[PDB]
Structures are given as structure tokens and as C-alpha cells.
Design a protein around this nucleic acid. Structure first.
Length: 107
RNA sequence: AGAUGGUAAGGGCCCACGGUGGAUGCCUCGGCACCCGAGCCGAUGAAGGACGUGGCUACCUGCGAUAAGCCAGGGGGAGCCGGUAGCGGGCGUGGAUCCCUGGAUGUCCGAAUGGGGGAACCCGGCCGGCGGGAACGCCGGUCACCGCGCUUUUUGCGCGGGGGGAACCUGGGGAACUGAAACAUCUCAGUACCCAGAGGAGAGGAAAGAGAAAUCGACUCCCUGAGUAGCGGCGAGCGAAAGGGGACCAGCCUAAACCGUCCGGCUUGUCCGGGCGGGGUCGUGGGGCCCUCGGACACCGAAUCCCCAGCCUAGCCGAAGCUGUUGGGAAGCAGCGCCAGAGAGGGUGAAAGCCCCGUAGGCGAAAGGUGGGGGGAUAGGUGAGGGUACCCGAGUACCCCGUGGUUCGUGGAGCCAUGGGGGAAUCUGGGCGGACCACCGCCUAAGGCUAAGUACUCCGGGUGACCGAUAGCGCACCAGUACCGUGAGGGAAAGGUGAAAAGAACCCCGGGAGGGGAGUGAAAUAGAGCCUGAAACCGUGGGCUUACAAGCAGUCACGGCCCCGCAAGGGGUUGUGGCGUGCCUAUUGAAGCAUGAGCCGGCGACUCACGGUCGUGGGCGAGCUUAAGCCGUUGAGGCGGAGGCGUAGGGAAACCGAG
RNA sequence: GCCGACCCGCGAGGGCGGCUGGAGGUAAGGGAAGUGCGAAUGCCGGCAUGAGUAACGAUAAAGAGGGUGAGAAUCCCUCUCGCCGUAAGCCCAAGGGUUCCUACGCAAUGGUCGUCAGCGUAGGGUUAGGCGGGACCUAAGGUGAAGCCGAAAGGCGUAGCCGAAGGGCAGCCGGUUAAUAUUCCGGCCCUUCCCGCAGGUGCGAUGGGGGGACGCUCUAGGCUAGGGGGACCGGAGCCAUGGACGAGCCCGGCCAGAAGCGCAGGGUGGGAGGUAGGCAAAUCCGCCUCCCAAAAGCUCUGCGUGGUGGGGAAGCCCGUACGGGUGACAACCCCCCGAAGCCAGGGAGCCAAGAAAAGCCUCUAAGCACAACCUGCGGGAACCCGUACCGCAAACCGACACAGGUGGGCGG
């Protein structure tokens, strides 16, 4: 309960400490431990030479996790957190004044 | 002939490098206490277990033949199929996970409840269903005994009934250690423990009261009264109510009289007993019957009846920032800016009012739950007089005896209550005002119901001059677990890589085990029960010293060896010699052949509450000061004089009173 | 935390600096206290001392060849020795829970080892109409409607109900899997209840009697389990070293089995009359008088036999293992010994005076007489819990592979 955070699955830049200020994609929320996985911490793993799937060159990885409570919003600008009006019907959580939500698709 | 340094089997002493090992610091999904709210679960089978349950599944938790879940109601907006990774395959804006409600399935055991029984296993009667289905077998219903109320006794119909419960609470039972420096009376204590049973409270509850004033006016509670008055082998010690100031405020239902009514009986009778109803409720007594005024349209009206706001069972919105910069990392530093009814906190690789959750502020119920806060209704309550002479709670009061409660241990012993015995009266009746008698008062006994105010912590929410893995609950963690005992019961150990798993591919030796780079990250001297690595602790290298040598082991000085230092000086070492009865407890007195300790690390012992009591630091000063409580606060205080100290003592006492 | 030869204070400490470490810390002034350890044969935890010593579990004993492997005293195949042999062999339950089996494995666990294993892992294995148990029965006992009592909690408790290795009740042989088999396979034996056909009877109770049915001591006839010998039966071998082809040594020479046959034995008199006993229902027992017979008939069991199915060794071949064959058309015959066991409820003797209930025999009530019951043959159904593996011991009671203890059977 109360796993609710602000980071959605779209495209959002970094405000971290390693790759500070980096543009990142959908981010893929995993999960409710407060972690992200966008396109920032690219790592290579020490996987073995597992005869089928991990061929003969065992030393490879793709996208490495990273913490949620660090990344930050986009729109015609950059950051600036979201703001939700109950729209009377559905929701409209645009960026700080600079408009447009994040759901799109007839939102 | 004489002279005199020199080897280390191994040893010690020092430094350095390690290992075992765990302390310590810091941390904290744990706990602590206080307040606050809240306060019952059951035959609609509980609290609580057993076997099961997932596609691969030991634990755990959730759950139960529909088994990690079932359908609707509400919420919510992007992830999801639990911790616990993999195989595998699903999940959703035709809006899933999940929080809140309601119900669906609910095998087996437990009051167990058809019967049985070594809990969780084995049988059975009847109602009905499935296999071809009568022989065997499954399935839904139903079946124990208690009360208590109607049925034609009959068969039955019916509302209830049990077990539990952390603590408190009412009664039925009821010890001893210990105190009295012995020990019986007394104390501890009517405590501990057994039992019964009730509930959010319990119990209690409207005066046969109190108590001396023509004074008050249920019950529980606080504080005061007050260690007061008494009690007592006048010892231990035990130790009242009144009154007061405050919290809370509520007051009531019946029997008997008189009248009716259906029933039972019988020696029919102006009738003994009964079902029910009318009827009545008291301290200048009320009530009865008849009469007297007029008894009434109104007046009161819930604790019972209902409705609705608020309260809870999830949630929702929610002010304010960036560039450069050292660092693996910034919130740190610099610069300029911004919010505030919000500078509470938490995290974010570190130290943030403006990065994420959030606080302040405002909102929220279709379903459940709760409801005097207020509105409705309803049960029920409202009279002045006169006579009559009906009733006014019986094996009761009273009396006696053996006695428990009370301050009362037997006192002059009341009063309340009662075991055996005798044994009343009806308002001139009657209990008590402490032998008993007079009087004068007080109250109406022997039927019952009563909220709030006080108690309590299984539980949730909030606080901290409470603890941080020997502390804290026994349990931070897969703890009422392992393991010990038949047994009732006992009761362990055991936290932490890192910001993130990025948790080490590959070659190398080796059976592996484990290591050597590679490689990981800021750091691998963070390398996997790994943060930080005290000591005891055993290793290893090197400086000094030791094979004629007598010792509480060191002290003091002289010499020499090594390493320091610009000097002068120093540290380390020990050839030699001057000297030298270990530490503690107990003792007249101990090195002790008196005792306590292998050594190391942590735990570990003069407090606290109330009263007294000497001083002392202040304020006030013949005056000083408030407890309970209430009001305010969210570490904000303040009102609240009831009372205690003080202004006077002497006498056992009446009393007298600076005598 | 570690290091120190500097500074300050009489001191207890404080500053300083170097090394370590990784985020908390708190001055000056005040305050609150579970505050200061060397000791309590003190509490927990850790590491030593003796001491590389005592011990390493029975004096029944080990020796070699090959093999596995990185590694063989310690595992496995063979040869050799020795010890138990009323056992230290084979069961039976009790007891423990997967210890059994098959493949792989050694970090600990075996007082060293380990390639072994009761240890790790995953996979498997436990069958029932007849053994045991329950929908049967009682005993001592317990529970327990009622009865009674007790301050409570409870005590005794009749009827009923649970309760045993006691009663009774239908299953014996060989085969077979890696491992269980009276459970599956097969050759035979039979029970249980239901429907029908056929025959036959008054049916039939939880209520009455019959019976079950019982002590010790000695002991009968046959019979068998088991046991010994054969010149004889059947075989794969063997003449050794001085003798021998001797009836030479050596192996084995059965198991089940209904109907029927033979054998032994246990049980029981047949019939009539009456009857106010059996807490009257009785033709049944009891009981008084009568007839015959005491043999024998009736009748259950014990043995042997029986058609049929099953078994079957020394040795050799290979096979590591287990065993597969070999192993035969297999022989399966006689003489003797003889059970403590069998016929069961046998005989005799004695004093201490020797369970109970249901099955089973049966009489009648209730009631039924189309029913129901008995026989028979046919046709259908007959469930639910057990079994693996240790069991005079390593798995069980003793904290341990303790030299301890452990009922009953086979025990040559």
C-alpha cells in the first residue's frame, strides 16, 4: 500500500549523481522498492559461458536497474514536477504550468 | 705458562607484519513506558490446531475440495501473477495488482454437539441424491444433554444454553514464610493461589442513612480529613466514618389493601388456593372504600421508538530552483532566486523548506460500523378535604447462644450481617442514635431494576531529558524454535557486504578445497554471516640479551649493543652490583604452607517512591502555601483555598489562659 | 580503533600529532542519571594450561593377489587364517520413523582413514474377502442417562459405551521385481453378503436354557514336526603321496493337496408321562416315575494317502555386482530315532478349588403367514487403517556404533 510515486513510463531526464542530467526513455518502473531502469546505468555483467544462450564469450549485460527517487519530468522545457487537476471527468497532470499531461492517447 | 671477547638446541625482552577471536563506535523491519482512543469472539461452530493447497514448492504467510484464491459495492491509474531467485506462461486504459466494505466456498480436529475415541481417526439411525447400482461405496440434510415458555398427556414447536478471554471486577473457598529480633493472640492478609460467574466496565445504588445542628439528603470516584479517633501479649503494628472542597447527577419497577376476571378443588360456599389483569408505592405516611371540590381540555414525556450531522472501516489534492564547483558520490561551497496556515520528518550514493514520499491546509462513503449531538413519537407521571377503619413485605424483626464486618483482639460492645433455639406486631406498627431505662430526634426494614463519574490493558493511534543486539520483551532474525525431562515445565544461540549485485566470466596450479592475476566498484585491507577488527590468543621476520647460573622478577645506578637526534639529549636492550616478604578478603597480627581468582573482553551492586529530619539556596513574611479538579497549550501556562504549617501555652481531664 | 621519546593538570584526564576508519558528533554555561570493576570457587563469551601426553570401546586376528582411483591397512572381486555357532545364526512383536533400495557425492558426520556408509542428494519402493484391526464380544478398569452426596472444583456411580497378545472367527504351497508379497502371479481351499431359480421348515429376539469353559502335579495310544543310517536311488567331479576301484569320498533323496480310502481320537444315551422352577411366554434346560441300551449309532477333529500344480542339490561355465546358467526327463526309495507339539473338553492324582461375554445349539414372545427362515445350485457385490527397513541390536531404553538392558518362537 502507498507505493504511489510520481515517475511514469514515458521519457524523462536524469537528476542523479553518476550520469547527472541525462535524457532517458520509458524508464520501466521496477517495482515498488523505489527503483528505475531507463537508459543511464549501462553495465556489462560477468555471466558465464553458458553453452546455449550465453555462447562462448561470457562477459555481457544490457540495462542495469537504478533508484526511482532521482529522475525528473519533461515537456516544452525540461524538469518541473507534475500538477494534477481533477478535470471534473478524468485526470490532467500537466507539467508545472507548461501544459500537456503524460498519458496522451485522448487524455 | 699467563691473558681475555666469543656459539643458541632453544629461551626471554622490543618493534613490525599477521591469525584466531570477538569487544567497541555508529547504525536499527525490535522492544519500553506514558497518554489517548477503544473495549468483547461463540451452535451463522469461535479463540486455537491437522492434513492439505501453487504446474515444478521444505519453510513461511494467505488460504481451503471453488484451496497464494470466488462474485458484486467503493476506491485507484500502470503496473501485476506474495517473501524467493530460476523454469514456465499469464495480467491489464472493453481499465488489472492492491487498500475499504459485504457476502460465496468453508474438508478434518476444539464447548464438539449422532455414537465412539489414545484431538485431528473409526462407526451409525433416519430424509434424499450417484455409480448397472439392491448387495460395496461417495454426497447435501439431520441426530448429544441443560434451561425455560405454549402443545391433548402424546409426537413435539419454540427463544435461549455451553467454550474462551491480556488485564481488571462481584462473590464462594483461603495458606505460610516474615514481623513481633523467641513464639500462639495479632502481623503478613482476607494477600497469594483454587472456584463460580458476570462486562465494557464490573460491583454498587435512593436511605429502618448519616449525625446533634430543628444539619444534610442515591451509588461509584478524586483529594482533604488524617496516622486523625480508636484498636492491641497498650508490642508488632493495624488504623476508621463524619464534615469539607471537587468529578458525576437519575431516578425507579412490584407485593399486600380494594375490584374484576378464566382455572383447580372441595366438607357449594356471600369459599381455601391459583393464571392474568385492573390497581398502589410512603415520612406533614402513603395507598384502599364511600362521600366532599370539578375533575379535566392541558402539562410533564424518556433509560424505550426512530431519523440525521459529526466518529471509525481505504483514500484525495496539496506553496517554493537552478548554473558553476571540489569529490566515486552532493543536499556540501560559491553565486543569484523563491515558499510559508507548511523550517514536522524521512529518504535521495553525504549535511535539502523548494529532488521523491510528505508536514501545514482542505476534502472524502455506494457497502459495513457508531450515534442523545439535536428533532419527532411512545411507555409512563400532575390534586385540596372528611370519615371509615382494610393493607403496608415473617419463622422476619426481637430474644439467646455460638459468631463474622467495623477503629473495635471481648471491652461498658453497640450497630450491621447469621449458624442452632425459641419466637412478634401494622402507623400508638416499628430499627437506631454504642449496657440498659426515660425523653427527644432520624429513618420506614425483611421484593427487585439504575446511566455517567472510578478500575483495567489482549489491541490500535500518538509522545519521549526510554534501550540500541549481554541493552531491550524470553524472542530485532523463520521464537514460545532448537534442545533438555515421562511428565507438569525449563528455556538457547542467532543483526549490518555495497549507493547499486556491479556479488568475480577467463587462464593458472590443484580431486576438490582453496588460491595467483584478469576483471568489479570510490574503495575487494567492502570477497560473500564479509562495516568498524580491543585484548587474551597463537604465528613470522628482524634489534638487544642468554649454555658457573639462586628468583614476588622489578627498582637504581654503571658498563656495553642497536636505532634515533644538527647539538646536548633520547628510546630500546641487559653484563653487573646496591636493595627488595605478590594483589585482596579476614585478622591483635599474613609473604603466607589461611582464603578468592588460568588469562582476556563485556554484565554487574548503595537507588527510588512517601514521610520524617539537620542543614542549605532563594521568595514572601504574621502570615506561607494550595491537593483533587477545571480552563488553556501541543513541551505555554493559569485559575482553582478545600485543607496542612504558623500566630500560646499549662493541666490526665472540666477548665484556666501569659499564665 | 591503533602509535607515541610533545605540551597542560598533583591527580583522575585534556589538548597535539602520525596511522585506521567511514557520518556522526556538541564546546562555554546549566541540568537528568541504570555512571567509573580486580577480585564475589561471581554471569556470559573467547583462547590457552597439562599435553602432542591419557585414551582412540572388548586380546576372536589377521596375510596376500588383483581392481577402482588423484589417493587404498581402512572400499570391492579371489585366495588364506582364525571366532561365535541355545549364537555373535533365523523369526516375533515392542520400539524408531524412509534408516531399505538404485545412480552420483565426501565439506562436516564414523574416536585416523575413506573412492565405503545408517551421513548429502534427487529418483523410487510400502498393495489384501482370509495375517493384524475395525463396522463382534466381554475381563480387571474407565467413562457414564439416572440415584445419592459434596461450599465450588468434584467423589462413588446402576443401565448403556470404549477398552486384550484373553474368547471366537474363512489361506496353504512354490514363482517372481533393484527393493514389498499369506497382500501380485499361479496350482489348489474356503468364507461374506445381495438377487434369482429349486427344494425344504412354522419362521424368528437384544428375552430363557444348552454350550463356550478353563487349577496345579504326573501320564495314555497312535500321529507328526524335527532327527539319524542305508549296500539302495539320481549326478558334475575326484584315485592323489605308500595302499584301494572299496557298499570309496560328495551332493541331494520332497511341498502343497478339497471329494474319497485307511488310522487314531474328542464329544453325545435314545424314548414316554407329568410340572404350581427357570423372576411363566414356551415343546428348550431343569426336575420326580416308567421303556430299552450300556454296545452302538450319531458326530467334530488329529494323522497318513490321494487326482493335480510346484519344488529340487554337490560341482562346473561365465558373471566384478545380483546371480544367469549349469540343473538333471533330475533321484525324490527303505531301516531306525522320535517331539515338550497334534487328536481336546483324553486318563490318573491332589488341595490351594481352578475368568467373563458373544460366535455356535437352540425355546418361545412381539409379529408374520405373497413374508420370513434352512439347504442347494446359479448369477452379482465383499469395504476402511497396517506392511518398507532395523529388531537379543549402531536404527530400541540408556546424552555415544555405551561390552550395559530387551517378553515369546526355530535353534542343528
Amino acid at each position: 500500500r502507498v507505493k504511489m510515486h510520481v515517475k511514469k513510463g514515458d521519457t524523462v531526464l536524469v537528476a542523479s549523481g553518476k550520469y547527472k542530467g541525462r535524457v532517458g526513455k520509458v524508464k520501466e518502473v521496477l517495482p515498488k522498492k523505489y527503483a528505475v531502469i531507463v537508459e543511464g546505468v549501462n553495465i556489462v555483467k560477468k555471466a558465464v559461458r553458458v553453452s546455449p544462450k550465453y555462447p562462448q564469450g561470457g562477459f555481457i549485460e544490457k540495462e542495469a536497474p537504478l533508484h526511482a527517487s532521482k529522475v525528473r519530468p519533461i515537456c516544452p522545457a525540461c524538469g518541473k514536477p507534475t500538477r494534477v487537476r481533477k478535470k471534473f471527468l478524468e485526470n490532467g497532470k500537466k507539467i508545472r504550468v507548461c501544459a500537456k499531461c503524460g498519458g496522451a492517447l485522448d487524455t
